[PDB]
Amino acid sequence: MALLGTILLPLLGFALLGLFGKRMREPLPGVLASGLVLASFLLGAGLLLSGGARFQAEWLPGIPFSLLLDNLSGFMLLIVTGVGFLIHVYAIGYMGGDPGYSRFFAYFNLFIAMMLTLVLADSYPVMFIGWEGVGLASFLLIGFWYKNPQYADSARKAFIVNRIGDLGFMLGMAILWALYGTLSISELKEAMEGPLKNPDLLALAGLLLFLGAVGKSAQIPLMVWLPDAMAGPTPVSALIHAATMVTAGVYLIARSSFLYSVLPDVSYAIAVVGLLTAAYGALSAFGQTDIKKIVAYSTISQLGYMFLAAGVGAYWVALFHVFTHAFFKALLFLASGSVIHALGGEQDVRKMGGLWKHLPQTRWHALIGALALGGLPLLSGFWSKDAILAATLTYPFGGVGFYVGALLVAVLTAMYAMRWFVLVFLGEERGHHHPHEAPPVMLWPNHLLALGSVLAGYLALPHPLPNVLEPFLKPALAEVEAHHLSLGAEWGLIALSAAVALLGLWAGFVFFQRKVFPAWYLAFEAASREAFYVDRAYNALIVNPLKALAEALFYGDRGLLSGYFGLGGAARSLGQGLARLQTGYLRVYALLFVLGALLLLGVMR
Template identity: 45%
Template sequence: MLVLIILLPLFGFFFGIAFGRYNGKGTCFITSLTVFSSFFISFYFFIKLLFSGTFYKVTLFPWIFSDFLTINWNFYFDSLTLGMLIVITFISTLVHIYSIEYMKEDPHLNRFMSYLSLFTFFMLVLVTSNNFLQLFVGWEGVGLSSYLLINFWFTRIQANKSSIKAMVLNRIGDFFFLIAIFSLYLITNSLDFDVIFSLVTLIKEYYIQIGIAKFCVLDLICLCLFLGATGKSAQLGLHSWLPDAMEGPTPVSALIHAATMVTAGVFLIIRCSFLFEYSPLILNLIIIIGSITALFAATTGLLQNDIKRVIAYSTCSQLGYMFFACGLSSYDVGFFHLYNHAFFKALLFLGAGSVIHALANEQDMRKMGGLRIILPFSYSIMLIGSLSLIGFPFLSGFYSKDVILEIAYAKYNTFGHFAYYLGVLAAFCTAFYSTRVLILVFLINTNGFRTNILNAHEGSYFFVLPLFFLTILSIISGYLSKDLFIGFGTDFWSNVIFILPYNYSLSDIEFLNLFNKILPLLVVLIGIFSAIFLYFFTLPSYFNYKQTKWFKYVYIFLNRKWFFDKFIVELIGINVLTLSYLYNYKDIDRGVLENFGPFGIINNVNNTIKKVKKIQTGYIYHYMFYIFIAILILFIFSLINFNYILILFLFVMYLLF
């Protein structure tokens, strides 16, 4: 029965691809039913885990069998896996149902639903893997599925560019991930998690020397794992594909940002906690990159005008929180935030899709406004989703994000305080841009086109039902699951997550001073009121301030996304393209290799044939002359060597007879 959790979405994919054109809307029903069935089975075993603490390991069949490596198709169902299964299958089920209405006018609806099921299948393979190679299959499958879904409207140039960008940037991370996998195999002769994690104390004794520098192999492996996770979870440096992924249909954005692709990197770090705990250098690096990513994405989201792009940058920012939580060795808290984030982020994207659908696919917030009366349900769910994202008290985001910041300060070291203050600044920006979205879309006077406003309406129950469930969970999920995931004395994680005793700091947050505990809440309130003040009241002093040179520099810096895109394109992209085309392609591939390889051989053979053809003149006396020369040469050789007399005799006989 456990295997059905994984295989049912695959069946839905094959059914949609094979029979989609024959059964009309039947593909929508089958794919939604298969994913819902996966969720139902996952929920059953999750409840069973809570009461019995039972883990499961299912072996299907041998995959690779040799003298040096044995790998089976194993599926491992522990607390981390079952927690991820609940999130993935539940969000995927709601996205499938939502897509029936959202994509109903698209002629390729069956293909779209099939791709959603394929995406879900590969993510399930990833989180249930028992070894690194099987995890890598799911890892690459998720990347492939994201390419297919982002580029679903393949006639759009921007969708083509975005999908290729996502694929290329993820390949960079995958390269380092493969290096980590190969290194682990060379040291342990195994790719199974259980074997590798049990040998971690042996791995940390290996060192590699390059010149006078000496490096710990475990640090290098953890660095490669982190870089692989960075590509998948869009951390600073490999982040630019995530905001561009919104070029796909809105349900795709909800699935990618909430439950599947971007959570894969966080899952990898949590799963490999046994390795990272013995690499404090890389843990500190994760804290730095995660906290800077949280601030970078939050500040960049301040000036975005596309409603989906704002939410996309909020995803990047929240992933930064999850990463530096893992860097603080609070893997359980990182997962807790991942769990809560899935619900309110899916709610925000699907709520934004409801608004976009009502306004004839308009995504620019400057062309909206006044929708609170026209779309009251959409306004309600966007309000709840935004407040949960902000971390407003007693909503789901509050219970996880504030704990992350408190743990960061409770570390009482430079890296912890660095993450704390950057996280607080990111919380201010998050509150500001979330309130800005609500004001521009729902509260101010309308700026939209008259026809769009007059025709705007709420969606059918295919819209309402998923949004209703996500709204409820965005309110209560944090409160209900806090004690389960991060409560004192909880045995939910058992031996799935490993934390060294001196790295455990969850209990230290009880001794924080009151100011550091309430500071995130204070900056959130300041961010909310700042957005209300600036966008509801037009003040001459604010207008004059916007005209100052200092403000223009800040605006340009944030609007250009900290110049990361410019840096990547001009400093890296153009130089790599130049190197690849002018040198590798023209000089080496089309030059040296072609001339000394197949192209050179063909040219030499053709030139030789052309020279030989000149001998074929068609005149008999020329041929008689050639025969005479041949006989003369053979005669000379026969004088030197007796064996050539026989050859000369046979040649003359051939000419005579």
């Protein structure tokens, strides 16, 4: 019951800031929200340290309300609460002079409470409640400044894609109800081991669940909806791309590990899609001329990395990548937000350059972030990315091409991170920033974020060094493991990863300081800027034809109603043809009389 108050708090907060909301001074919404986030972090750490929590309440007949707080749930809870409070303070700073402060923080409280309801769940319906609640809050916050049509269609497309994924989720849930009749991950898992039945149906439910996960974490083909989330405020974009709404997909695989571990083709396909998403994000990142989108495509590549990890069965390794990511991508995004808060929201790259010397305490933040994303050999991202690279080979499903693929992806991530950093801070001088670039309580929580990013790190280390997260995560759930490993050659692989990351950093350094940009590279960069002409096709044969069929079926309904009118008109026409039978000459009336009487007398036999 105390576990439920953690979620109840950012409901009272949201109700206050939504109903009355602007009846408070400017700093207050952040104060209340941050207090609720911190008092949920505290009461969740206290419960987890106390061994765990369980709560059951009455709901739909056969479908009760089950909350389960274990190691895997508390891990996500602590992550989300800490990053959310840090982004809450950074938003207290960054939101200034903007109306809707209460709107902002009420949506924040709603987001946090719904994400907690999502992860803290023993029943799939509650997971889906959290899913659609997160989609709602995200669609709301992306369109926070609603006066712009440009930043409305973004959230529109976002929630449509989200609901496509959620429909896939609903169909998988209906499948896992028809078969067993439980739909509670605990008892469904305890009943699903042993006599598996209709393996086609099990793999199908897994396929639809993964389809929902793709929409949630913006994988192929639903990839396109994430970059437009640049429209939302920067702390919103951090919360959506780093701590929440993307971890839901990998967490679904982490909780359904019992299902996906007995599905070799399904897990192989999940790894394939993770690799494809990583490649797409990496290839199309640097061509993007906007800071937010060039970071969003890196988010795409990193989520592809995480799905690759969770695809081969490296669930604890995928959660390692999730931990590292939650640190460094929040660093990146809050850095970009302080940057455009210094330049008055200019929000471009080609209109940037030479911000290195100008900016104290910001070049350090951006450099730390760019190194973690590129995987600086001594940084958390390095451990996570190379643990995934190894788990590719060691864990099942083969990992043959995926290893060299992810290695080249590391090259490209380093390259585009260097492009970002150079074109934003080096190699020209443009624009204006006089008065106030560095804020206290904006760069201060970013300080703690960057520090943790540097030292997230060594919780998961190759087997000579302590792997702290594996024994914490494995016993509660994700129980099954079957993987080879080696030594000496594995550290040679670590050395290959470190060398590749450094060579990619310097390769981006030279290529993006050069300004040579050869003929083929210019076309490549242009195509990458337009996201490889994906949206043109997406609006070509699906969306615009859906509009066309809406219009055509409206025409068809018009014609159906006209046909009913034609029935009425046939009735009246038949009526007047029978009415014209009464001419008025008495001889006609007597003839028809005698005819009818004869007919009647004939029928009587």
